Short mmCIF file of N, CA and C and ligand atoms in Angstrom, two decimals:
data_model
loop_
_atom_site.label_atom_id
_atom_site.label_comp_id
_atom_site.label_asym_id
_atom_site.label_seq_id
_atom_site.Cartn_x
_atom_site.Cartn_y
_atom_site.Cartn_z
N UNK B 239 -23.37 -18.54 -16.02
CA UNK B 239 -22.41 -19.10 -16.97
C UNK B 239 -21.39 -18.04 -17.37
N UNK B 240 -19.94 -18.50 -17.38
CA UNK B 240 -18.65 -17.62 -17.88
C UNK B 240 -18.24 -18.28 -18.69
N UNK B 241 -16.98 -17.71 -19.72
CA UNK B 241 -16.32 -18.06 -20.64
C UNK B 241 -14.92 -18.81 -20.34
N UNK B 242 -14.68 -18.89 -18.81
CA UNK B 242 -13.53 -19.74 -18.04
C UNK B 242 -13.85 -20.98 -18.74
N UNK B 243 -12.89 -22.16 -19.27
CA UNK B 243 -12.90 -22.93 -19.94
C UNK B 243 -11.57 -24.12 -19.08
N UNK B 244 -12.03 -25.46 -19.44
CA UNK B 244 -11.21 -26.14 -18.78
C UNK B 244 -10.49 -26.17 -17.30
N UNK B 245 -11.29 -25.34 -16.72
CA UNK B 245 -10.81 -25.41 -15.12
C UNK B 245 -11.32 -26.79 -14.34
N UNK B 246 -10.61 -27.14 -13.45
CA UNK B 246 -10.77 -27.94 -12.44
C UNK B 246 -11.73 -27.65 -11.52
N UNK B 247 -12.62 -27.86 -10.87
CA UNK B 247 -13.82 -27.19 -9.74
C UNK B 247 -13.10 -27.82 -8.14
N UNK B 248 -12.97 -27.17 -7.87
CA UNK B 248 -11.88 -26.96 -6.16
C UNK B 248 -13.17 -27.60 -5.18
N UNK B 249 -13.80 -26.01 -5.31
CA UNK B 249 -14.83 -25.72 -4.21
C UNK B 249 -15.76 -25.33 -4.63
N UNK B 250 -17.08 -25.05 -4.17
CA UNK B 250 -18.03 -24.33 -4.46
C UNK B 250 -17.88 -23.00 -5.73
N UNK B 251 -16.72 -22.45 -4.67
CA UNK B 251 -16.45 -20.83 -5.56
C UNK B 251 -15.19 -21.00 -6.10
N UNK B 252 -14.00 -21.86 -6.31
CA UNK B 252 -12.65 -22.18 -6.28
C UNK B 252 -12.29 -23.29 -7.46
N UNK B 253 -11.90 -22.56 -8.68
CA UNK B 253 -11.30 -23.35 -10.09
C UNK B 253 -9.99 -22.74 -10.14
N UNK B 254 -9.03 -24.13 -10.16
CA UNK B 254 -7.83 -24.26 -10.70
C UNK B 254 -7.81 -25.27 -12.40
N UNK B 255 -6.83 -24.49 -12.97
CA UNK B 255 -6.12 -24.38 -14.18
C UNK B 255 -4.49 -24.58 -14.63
N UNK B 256 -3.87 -25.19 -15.48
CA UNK B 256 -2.18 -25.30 -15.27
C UNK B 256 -2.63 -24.16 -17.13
N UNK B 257 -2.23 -23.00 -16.76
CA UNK B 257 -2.21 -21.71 -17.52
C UNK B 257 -1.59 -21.17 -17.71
N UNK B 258 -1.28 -20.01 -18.15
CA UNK B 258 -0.46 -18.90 -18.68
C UNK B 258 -1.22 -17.65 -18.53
N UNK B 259 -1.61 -17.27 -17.07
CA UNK B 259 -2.16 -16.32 -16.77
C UNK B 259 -2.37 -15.09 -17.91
N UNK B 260 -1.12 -14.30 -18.49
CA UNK B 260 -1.01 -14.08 -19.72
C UNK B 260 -1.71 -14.14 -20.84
N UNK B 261 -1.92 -15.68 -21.49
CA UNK B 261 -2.19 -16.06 -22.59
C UNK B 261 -3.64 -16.35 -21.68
N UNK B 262 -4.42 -17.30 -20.70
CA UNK B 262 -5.72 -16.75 -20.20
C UNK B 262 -6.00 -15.85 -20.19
N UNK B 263 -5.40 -14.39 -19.88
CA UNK B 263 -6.17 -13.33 -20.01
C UNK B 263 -6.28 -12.86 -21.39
N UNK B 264 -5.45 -13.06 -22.27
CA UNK B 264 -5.89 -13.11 -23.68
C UNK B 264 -6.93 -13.11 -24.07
N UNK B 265 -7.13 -14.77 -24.02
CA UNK B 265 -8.09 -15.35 -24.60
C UNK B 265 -9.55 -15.24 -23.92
N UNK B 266 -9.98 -14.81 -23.00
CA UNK B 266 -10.99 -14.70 -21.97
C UNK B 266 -11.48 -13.47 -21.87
N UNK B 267 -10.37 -12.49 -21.70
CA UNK B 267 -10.87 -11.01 -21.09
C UNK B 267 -12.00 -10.46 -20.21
N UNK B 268 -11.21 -11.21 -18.84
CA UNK B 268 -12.08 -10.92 -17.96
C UNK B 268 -12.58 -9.87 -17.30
N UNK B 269 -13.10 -9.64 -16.20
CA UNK B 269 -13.89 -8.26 -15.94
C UNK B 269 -12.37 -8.18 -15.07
N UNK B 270 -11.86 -8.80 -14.02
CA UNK B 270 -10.50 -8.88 -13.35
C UNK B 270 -9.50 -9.50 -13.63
N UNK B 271 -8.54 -9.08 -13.96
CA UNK B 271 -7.16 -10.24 -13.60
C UNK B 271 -6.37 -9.76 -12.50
N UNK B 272 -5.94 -10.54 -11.43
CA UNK B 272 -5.21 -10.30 -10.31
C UNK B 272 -3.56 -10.26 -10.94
N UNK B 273 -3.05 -9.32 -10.51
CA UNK B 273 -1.44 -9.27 -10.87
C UNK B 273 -1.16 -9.15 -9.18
N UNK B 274 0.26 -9.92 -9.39
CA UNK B 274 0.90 -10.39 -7.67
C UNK B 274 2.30 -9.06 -7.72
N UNK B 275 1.47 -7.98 -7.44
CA UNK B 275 2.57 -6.95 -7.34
C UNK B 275 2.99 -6.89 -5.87
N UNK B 276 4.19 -5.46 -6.02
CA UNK B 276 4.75 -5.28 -4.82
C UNK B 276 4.10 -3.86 -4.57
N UNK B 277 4.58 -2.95 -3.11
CA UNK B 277 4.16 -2.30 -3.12
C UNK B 277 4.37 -1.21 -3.91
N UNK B 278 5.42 -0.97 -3.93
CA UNK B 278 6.12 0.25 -5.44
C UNK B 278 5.07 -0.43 -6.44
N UNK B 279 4.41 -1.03 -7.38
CA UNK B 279 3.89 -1.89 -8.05
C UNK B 279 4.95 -1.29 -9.32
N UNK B 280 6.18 -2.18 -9.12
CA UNK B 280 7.62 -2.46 -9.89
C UNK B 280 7.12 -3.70 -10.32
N UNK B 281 6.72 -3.83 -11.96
CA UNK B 281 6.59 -4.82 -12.56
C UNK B 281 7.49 -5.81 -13.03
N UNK B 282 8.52 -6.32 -12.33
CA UNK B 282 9.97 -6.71 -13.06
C UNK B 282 10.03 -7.56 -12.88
N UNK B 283 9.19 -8.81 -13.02
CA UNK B 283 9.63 -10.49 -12.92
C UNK B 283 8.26 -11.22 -11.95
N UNK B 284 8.52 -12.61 -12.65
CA UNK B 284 7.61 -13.03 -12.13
C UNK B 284 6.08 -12.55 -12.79
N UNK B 285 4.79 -13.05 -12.13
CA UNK B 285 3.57 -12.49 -12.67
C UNK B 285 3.46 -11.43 -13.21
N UNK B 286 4.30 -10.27 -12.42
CA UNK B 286 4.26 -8.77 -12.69
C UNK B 286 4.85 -8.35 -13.97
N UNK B 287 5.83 -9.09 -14.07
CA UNK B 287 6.88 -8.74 -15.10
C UNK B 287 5.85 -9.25 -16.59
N UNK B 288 5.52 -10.67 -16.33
CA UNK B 288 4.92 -10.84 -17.62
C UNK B 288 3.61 -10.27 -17.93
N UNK B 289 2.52 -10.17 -16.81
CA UNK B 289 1.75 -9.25 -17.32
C UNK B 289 1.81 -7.87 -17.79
N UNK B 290 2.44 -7.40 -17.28
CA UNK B 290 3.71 -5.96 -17.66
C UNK B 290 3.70 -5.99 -19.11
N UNK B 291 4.87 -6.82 -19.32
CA UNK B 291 5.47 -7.31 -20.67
C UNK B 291 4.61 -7.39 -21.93
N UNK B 292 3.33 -8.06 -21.43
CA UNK B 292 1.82 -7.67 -22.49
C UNK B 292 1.25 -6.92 -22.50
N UNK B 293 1.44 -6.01 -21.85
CA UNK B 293 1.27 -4.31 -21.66
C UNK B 293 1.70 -3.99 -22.61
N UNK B 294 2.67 -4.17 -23.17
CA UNK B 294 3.51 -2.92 -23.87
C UNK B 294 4.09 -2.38 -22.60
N UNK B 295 4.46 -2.46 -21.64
CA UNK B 295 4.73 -1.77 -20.70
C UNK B 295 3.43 -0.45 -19.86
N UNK B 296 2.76 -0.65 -20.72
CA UNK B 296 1.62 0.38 -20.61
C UNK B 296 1.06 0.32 -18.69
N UNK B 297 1.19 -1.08 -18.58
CA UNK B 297 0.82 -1.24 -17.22
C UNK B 297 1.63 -0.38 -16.25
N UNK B 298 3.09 -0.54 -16.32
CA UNK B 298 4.08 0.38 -15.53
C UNK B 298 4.07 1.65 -15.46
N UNK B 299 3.62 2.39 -16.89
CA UNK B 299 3.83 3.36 -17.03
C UNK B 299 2.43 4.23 -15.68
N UNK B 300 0.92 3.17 -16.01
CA UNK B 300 0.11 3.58 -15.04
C UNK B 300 0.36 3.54 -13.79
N UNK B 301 0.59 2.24 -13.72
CA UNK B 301 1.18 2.23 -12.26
C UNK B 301 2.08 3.74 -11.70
N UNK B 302 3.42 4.33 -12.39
CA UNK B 302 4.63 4.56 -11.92
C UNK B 302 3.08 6.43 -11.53
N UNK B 303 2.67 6.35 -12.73
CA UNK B 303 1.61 7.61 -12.17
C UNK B 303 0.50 7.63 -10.92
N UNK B 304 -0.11 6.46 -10.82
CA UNK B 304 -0.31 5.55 -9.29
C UNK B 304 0.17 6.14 -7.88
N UNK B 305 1.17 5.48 -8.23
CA UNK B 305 2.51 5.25 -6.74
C UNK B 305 2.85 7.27 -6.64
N UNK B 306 3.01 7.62 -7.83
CA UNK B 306 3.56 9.34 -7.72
C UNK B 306 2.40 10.33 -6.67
N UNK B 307 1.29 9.83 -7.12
CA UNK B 307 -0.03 10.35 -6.17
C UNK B 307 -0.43 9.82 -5.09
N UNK B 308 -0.62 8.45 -5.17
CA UNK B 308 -0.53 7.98 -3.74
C UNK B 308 0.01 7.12 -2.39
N UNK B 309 1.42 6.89 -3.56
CA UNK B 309 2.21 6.18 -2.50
C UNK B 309 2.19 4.76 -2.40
N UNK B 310 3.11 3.93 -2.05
CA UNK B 310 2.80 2.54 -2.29
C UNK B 310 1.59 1.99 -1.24
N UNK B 311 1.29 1.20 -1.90
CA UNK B 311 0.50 0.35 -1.23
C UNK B 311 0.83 -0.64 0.01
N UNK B 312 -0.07 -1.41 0.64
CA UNK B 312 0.12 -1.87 2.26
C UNK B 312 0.30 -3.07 1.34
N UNK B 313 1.20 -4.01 2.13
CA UNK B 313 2.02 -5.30 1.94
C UNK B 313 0.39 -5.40 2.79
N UNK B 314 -0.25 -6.60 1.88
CA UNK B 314 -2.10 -7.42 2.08
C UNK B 314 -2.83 -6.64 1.51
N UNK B 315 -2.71 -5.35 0.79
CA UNK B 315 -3.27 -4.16 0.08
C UNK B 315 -3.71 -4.45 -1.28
N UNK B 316 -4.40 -3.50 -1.57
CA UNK B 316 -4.62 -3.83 -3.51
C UNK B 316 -4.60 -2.36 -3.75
N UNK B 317 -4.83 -2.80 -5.14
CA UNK B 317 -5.58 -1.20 -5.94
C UNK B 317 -6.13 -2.13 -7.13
N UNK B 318 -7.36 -0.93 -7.63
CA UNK B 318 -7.58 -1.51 -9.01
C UNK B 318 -7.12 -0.76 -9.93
N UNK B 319 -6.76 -0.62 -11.49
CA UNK B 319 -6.22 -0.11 -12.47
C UNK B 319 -6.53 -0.72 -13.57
N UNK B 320 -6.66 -0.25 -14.77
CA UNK B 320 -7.13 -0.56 -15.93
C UNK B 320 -6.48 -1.72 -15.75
N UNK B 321 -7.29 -3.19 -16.86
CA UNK B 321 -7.04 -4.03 -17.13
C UNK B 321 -6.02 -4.33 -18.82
N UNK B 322 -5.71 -3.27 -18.89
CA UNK B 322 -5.20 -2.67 -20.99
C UNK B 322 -5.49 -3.99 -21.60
N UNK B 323 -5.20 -4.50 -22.45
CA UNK B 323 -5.29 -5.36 -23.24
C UNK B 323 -5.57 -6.77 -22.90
N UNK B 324 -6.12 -7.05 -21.60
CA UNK B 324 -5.81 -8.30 -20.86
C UNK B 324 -7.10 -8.30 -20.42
N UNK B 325 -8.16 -7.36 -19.73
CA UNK B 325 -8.55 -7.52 -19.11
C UNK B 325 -9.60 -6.21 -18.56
N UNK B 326 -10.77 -6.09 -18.43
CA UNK B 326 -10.96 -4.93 -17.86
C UNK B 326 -10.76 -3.70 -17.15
N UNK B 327 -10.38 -4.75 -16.40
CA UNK B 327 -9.73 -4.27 -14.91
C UNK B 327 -8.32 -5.14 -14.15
N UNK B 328 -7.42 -4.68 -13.68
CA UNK B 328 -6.25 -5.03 -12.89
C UNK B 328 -6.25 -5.13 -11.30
N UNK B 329 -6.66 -6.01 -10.50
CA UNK B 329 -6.67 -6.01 -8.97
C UNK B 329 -5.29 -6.09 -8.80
N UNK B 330 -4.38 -4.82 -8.16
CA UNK B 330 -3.13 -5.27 -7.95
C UNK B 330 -3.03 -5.93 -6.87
N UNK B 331 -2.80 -6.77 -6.11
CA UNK B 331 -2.84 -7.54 -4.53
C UNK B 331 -1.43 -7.80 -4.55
N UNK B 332 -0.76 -7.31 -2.99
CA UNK B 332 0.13 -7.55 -2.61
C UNK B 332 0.41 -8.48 -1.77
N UNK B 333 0.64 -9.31 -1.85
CA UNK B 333 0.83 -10.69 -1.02
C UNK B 333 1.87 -10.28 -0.30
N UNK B 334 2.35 -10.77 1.21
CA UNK B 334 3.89 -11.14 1.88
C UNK B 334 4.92 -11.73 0.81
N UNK B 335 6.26 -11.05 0.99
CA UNK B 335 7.33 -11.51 0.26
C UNK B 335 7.85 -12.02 0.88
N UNK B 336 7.92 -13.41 1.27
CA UNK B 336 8.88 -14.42 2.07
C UNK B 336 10.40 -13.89 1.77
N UNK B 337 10.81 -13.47 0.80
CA UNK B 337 12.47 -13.28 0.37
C UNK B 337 12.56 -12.01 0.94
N UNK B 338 11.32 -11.06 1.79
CA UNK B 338 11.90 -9.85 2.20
C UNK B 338 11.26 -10.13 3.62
N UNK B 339 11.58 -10.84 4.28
CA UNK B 339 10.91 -11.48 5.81
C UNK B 339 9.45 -11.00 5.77
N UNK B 340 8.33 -10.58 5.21
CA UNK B 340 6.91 -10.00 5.46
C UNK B 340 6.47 -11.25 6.00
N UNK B 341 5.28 -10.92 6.81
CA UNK B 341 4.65 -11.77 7.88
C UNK B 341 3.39 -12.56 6.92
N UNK B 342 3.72 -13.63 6.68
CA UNK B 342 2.76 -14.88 6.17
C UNK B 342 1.42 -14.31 6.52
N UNK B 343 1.07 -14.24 7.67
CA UNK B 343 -0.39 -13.88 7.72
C UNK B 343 -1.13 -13.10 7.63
N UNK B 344 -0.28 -12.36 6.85
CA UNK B 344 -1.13 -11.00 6.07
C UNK B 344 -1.47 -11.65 4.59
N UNK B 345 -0.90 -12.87 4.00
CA UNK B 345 -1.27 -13.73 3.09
C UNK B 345 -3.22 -14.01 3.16
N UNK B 346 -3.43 -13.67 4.19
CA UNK B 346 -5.04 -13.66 4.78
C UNK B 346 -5.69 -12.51 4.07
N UNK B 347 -5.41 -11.46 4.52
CA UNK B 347 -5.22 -9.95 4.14
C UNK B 347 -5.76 -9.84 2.58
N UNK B 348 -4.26 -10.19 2.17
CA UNK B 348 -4.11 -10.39 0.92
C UNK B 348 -5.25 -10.80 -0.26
N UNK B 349 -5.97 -12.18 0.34
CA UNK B 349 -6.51 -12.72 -0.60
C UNK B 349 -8.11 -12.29 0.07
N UNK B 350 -8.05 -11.11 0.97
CA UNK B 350 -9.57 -10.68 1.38
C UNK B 350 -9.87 -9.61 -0.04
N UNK B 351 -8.91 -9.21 -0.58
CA UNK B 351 -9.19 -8.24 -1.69
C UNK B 351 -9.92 -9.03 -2.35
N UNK B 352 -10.11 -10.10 -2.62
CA UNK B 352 -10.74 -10.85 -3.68
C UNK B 352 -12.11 -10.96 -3.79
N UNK B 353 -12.37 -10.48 -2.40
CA UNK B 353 -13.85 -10.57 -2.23
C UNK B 353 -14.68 -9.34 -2.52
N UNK B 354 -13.50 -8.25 -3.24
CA UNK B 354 -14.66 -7.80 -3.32
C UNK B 354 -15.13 -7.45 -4.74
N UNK B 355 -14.70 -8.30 -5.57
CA UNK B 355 -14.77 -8.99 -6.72
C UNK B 355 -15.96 -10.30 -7.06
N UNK B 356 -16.62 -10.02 -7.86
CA UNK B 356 -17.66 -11.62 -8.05
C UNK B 356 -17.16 -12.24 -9.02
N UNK B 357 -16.41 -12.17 -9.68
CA UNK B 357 -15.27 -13.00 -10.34
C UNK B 357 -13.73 -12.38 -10.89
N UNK B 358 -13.31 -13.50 -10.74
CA UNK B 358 -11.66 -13.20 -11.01
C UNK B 358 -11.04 -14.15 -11.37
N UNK B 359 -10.09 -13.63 -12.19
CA UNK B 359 -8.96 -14.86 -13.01
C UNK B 359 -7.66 -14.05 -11.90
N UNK B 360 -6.61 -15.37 -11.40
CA UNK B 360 -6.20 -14.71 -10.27
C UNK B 360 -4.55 -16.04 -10.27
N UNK B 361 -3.72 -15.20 -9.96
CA UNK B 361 -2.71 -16.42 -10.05
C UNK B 361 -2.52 -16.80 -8.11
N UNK B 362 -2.19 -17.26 -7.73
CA UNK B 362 -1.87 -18.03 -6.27
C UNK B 362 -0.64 -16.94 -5.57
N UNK B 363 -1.42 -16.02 -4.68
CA UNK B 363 -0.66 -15.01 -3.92
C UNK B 363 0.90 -15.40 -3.29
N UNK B 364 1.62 -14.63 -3.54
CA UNK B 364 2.80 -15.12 -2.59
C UNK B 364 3.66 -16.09 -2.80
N UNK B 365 3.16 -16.76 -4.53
CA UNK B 365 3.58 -18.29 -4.90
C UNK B 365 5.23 -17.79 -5.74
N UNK B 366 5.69 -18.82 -6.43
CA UNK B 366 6.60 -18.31 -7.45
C UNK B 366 7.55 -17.36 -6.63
N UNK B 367 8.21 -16.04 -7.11
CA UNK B 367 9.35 -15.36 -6.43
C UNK B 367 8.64 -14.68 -5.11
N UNK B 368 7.27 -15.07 -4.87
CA UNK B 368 7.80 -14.41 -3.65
C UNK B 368 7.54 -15.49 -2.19
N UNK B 369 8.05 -16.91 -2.90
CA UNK B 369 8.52 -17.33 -1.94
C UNK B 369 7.74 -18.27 -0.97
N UNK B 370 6.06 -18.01 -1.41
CA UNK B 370 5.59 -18.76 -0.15
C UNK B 370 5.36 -20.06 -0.65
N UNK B 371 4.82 -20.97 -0.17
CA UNK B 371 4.47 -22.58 -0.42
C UNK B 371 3.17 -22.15 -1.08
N UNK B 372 3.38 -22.60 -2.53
CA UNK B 372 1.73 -23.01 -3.29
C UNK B 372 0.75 -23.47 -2.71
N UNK B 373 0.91 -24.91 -1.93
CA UNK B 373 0.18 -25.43 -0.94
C UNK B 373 -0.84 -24.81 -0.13
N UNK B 374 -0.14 -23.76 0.59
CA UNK B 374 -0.06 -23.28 1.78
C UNK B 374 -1.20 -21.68 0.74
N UNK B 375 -0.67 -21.25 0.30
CA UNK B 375 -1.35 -20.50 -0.52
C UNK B 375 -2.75 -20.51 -1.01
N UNK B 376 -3.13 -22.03 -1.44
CA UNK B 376 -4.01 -22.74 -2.21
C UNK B 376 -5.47 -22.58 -1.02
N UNK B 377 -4.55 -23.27 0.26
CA UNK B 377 -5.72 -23.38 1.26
C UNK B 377 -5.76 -22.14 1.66
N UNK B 378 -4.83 -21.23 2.01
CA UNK B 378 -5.62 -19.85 2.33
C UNK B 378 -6.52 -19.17 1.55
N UNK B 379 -6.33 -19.44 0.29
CA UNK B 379 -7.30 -18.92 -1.06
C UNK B 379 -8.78 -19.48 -0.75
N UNK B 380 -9.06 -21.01 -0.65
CA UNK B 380 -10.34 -21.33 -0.83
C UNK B 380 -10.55 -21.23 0.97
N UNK B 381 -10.29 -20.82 1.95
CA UNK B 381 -10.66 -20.48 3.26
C UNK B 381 -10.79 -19.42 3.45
N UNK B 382 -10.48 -17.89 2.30
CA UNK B 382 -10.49 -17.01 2.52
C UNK B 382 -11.71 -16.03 1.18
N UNK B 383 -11.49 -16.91 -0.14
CA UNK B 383 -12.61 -16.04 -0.78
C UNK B 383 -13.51 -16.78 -0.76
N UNK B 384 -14.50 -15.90 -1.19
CA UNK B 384 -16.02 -16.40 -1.12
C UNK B 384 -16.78 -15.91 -2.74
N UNK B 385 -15.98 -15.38 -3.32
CA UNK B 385 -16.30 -14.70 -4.38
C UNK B 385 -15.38 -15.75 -5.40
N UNK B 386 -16.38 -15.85 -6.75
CA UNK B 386 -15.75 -17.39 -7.87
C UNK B 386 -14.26 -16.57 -8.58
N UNK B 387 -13.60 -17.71 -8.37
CA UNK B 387 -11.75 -17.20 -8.68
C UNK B 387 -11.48 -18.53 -9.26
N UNK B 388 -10.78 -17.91 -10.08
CA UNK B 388 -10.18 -18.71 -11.60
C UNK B 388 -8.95 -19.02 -11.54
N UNK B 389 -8.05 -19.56 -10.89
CA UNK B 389 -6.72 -19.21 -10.81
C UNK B 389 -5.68 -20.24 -11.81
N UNK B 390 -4.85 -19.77 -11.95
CA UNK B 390 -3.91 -20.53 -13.07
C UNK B 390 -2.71 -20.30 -13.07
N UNK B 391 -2.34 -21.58 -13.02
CA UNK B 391 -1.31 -21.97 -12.15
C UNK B 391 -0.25 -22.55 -13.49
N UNK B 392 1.10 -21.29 -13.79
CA UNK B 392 2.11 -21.68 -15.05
C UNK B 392 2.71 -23.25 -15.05
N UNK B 393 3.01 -23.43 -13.61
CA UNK B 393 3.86 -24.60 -13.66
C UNK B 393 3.29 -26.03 -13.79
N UNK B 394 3.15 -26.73 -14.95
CA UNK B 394 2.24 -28.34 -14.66
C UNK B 394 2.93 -29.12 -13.41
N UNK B 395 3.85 -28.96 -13.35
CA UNK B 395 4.39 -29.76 -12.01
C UNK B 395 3.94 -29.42 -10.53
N UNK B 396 4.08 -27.99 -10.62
CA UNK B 396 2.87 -27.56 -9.26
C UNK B 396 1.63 -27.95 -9.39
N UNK B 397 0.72 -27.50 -10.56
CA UNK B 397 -0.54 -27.87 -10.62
C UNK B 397 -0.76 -29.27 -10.06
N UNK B 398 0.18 -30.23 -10.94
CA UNK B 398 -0.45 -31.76 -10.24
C UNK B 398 -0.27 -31.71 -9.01
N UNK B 399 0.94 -31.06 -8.28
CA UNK B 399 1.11 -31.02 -6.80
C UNK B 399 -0.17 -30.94 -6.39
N UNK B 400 -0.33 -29.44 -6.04
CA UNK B 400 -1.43 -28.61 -5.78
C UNK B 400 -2.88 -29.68 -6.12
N UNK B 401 -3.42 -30.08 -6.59
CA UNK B 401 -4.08 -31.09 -7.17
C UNK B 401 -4.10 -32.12 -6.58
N UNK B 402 -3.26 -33.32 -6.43
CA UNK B 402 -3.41 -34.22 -5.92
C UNK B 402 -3.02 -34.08 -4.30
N UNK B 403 -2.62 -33.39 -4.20
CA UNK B 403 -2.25 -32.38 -2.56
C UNK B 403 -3.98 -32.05 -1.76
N UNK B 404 -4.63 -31.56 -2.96
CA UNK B 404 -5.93 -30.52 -2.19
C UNK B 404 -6.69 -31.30 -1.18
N UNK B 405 -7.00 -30.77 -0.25
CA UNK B 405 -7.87 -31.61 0.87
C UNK B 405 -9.05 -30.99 0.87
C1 QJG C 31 1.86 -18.05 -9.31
C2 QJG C 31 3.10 -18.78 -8.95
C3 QJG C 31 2.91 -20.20 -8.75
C4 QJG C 31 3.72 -20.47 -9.95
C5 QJG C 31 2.91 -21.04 -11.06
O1 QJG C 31 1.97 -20.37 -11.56
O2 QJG C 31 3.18 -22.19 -11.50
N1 QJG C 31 3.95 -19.05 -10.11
C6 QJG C 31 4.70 -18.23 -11.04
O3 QJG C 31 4.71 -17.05 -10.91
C7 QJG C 31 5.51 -18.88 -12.16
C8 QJG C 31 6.32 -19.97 -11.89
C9 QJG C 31 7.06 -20.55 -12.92
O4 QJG C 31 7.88 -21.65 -12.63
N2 QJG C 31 7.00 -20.08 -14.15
C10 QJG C 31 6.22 -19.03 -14.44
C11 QJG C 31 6.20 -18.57 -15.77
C12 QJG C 31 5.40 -17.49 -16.11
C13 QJG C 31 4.63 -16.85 -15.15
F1 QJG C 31 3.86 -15.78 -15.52
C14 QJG C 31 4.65 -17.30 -13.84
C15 QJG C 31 5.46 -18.40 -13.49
#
């Protein structure tokens, strides 16, 4: 038993939510929250920006000390980093940026970080600015973790998509 509340049950291991990743990690404070960074992990819009933003900026500032020592991370890559006020812990996962041509099927890649996690509150890799199909996202998520993921999804109009879409 977890303190995830009002999710939808997908799959076996796979709950969707129409959330405020943000305001979920608030209220929950999980052992993970997934932030959909880049490789610089430049928090400026999108997931990044607002989890950032409830930082205090505090998140960037770790990060920018991060990236100074070891360099950005692999586009399908992660890191973990304090979770500050949100969360235990921070899985950064870099999904493909469709708006910077990166190759979709490292979107695979991507959501293998998850596994090595036994739970996670997690927003939909690659969705929102960077471009890929929610859809398309959704099924690589529950074909790819195996480990229970919470994900929450800002937009109600995607969610019902995503939702009445799921196969
Ligand atoms: C994860 C992908 C799918 C989509 C969603 O969650 O609905 N994403 C967003 O990043 C997103 C979109 C949107 O329209 N408003 C948002 C508002 C706040 C926020 F933190 C994220 C969003």
């Amino acid at each position: 038993v977890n303190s995830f509340s009002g999710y939808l049950k997908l799959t076996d291991n796979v709950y969707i939510k129409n959330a405020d990743i943000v305001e979920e990690a608030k209220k929950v404070k999980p052992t993970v929250v997934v932030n959909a960074a880049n490789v610089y992990l430049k928090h400026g819009g999108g997931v990044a920006g607002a989890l950032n933003k409830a930082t205090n900026n505090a998140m960037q500032v770790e990060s920018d000390d991060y990236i100074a020592t070891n360099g950005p991370l692999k586009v399908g890559g992660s890191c973990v980093l304090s979770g500050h006020n949100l969360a235990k812990h921070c899985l950064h996962v870099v999904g493909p940026n469709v708006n910077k041509g990166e190759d979709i099927q490292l979107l695979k890649s991507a959501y293998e970080n998850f596994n090595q996690h036994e739970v996670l509150l997690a927003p939909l890799l690659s969705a929102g600015i960077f471009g890929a199909d929610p859809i398309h996202s959704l099924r690589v998520c529950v074909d790819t973790v195996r480990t229970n993921v919470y994900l929450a999804v800002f937009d109600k109009n995607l969610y019902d998509k995503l939702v009445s879409s799921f196969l």
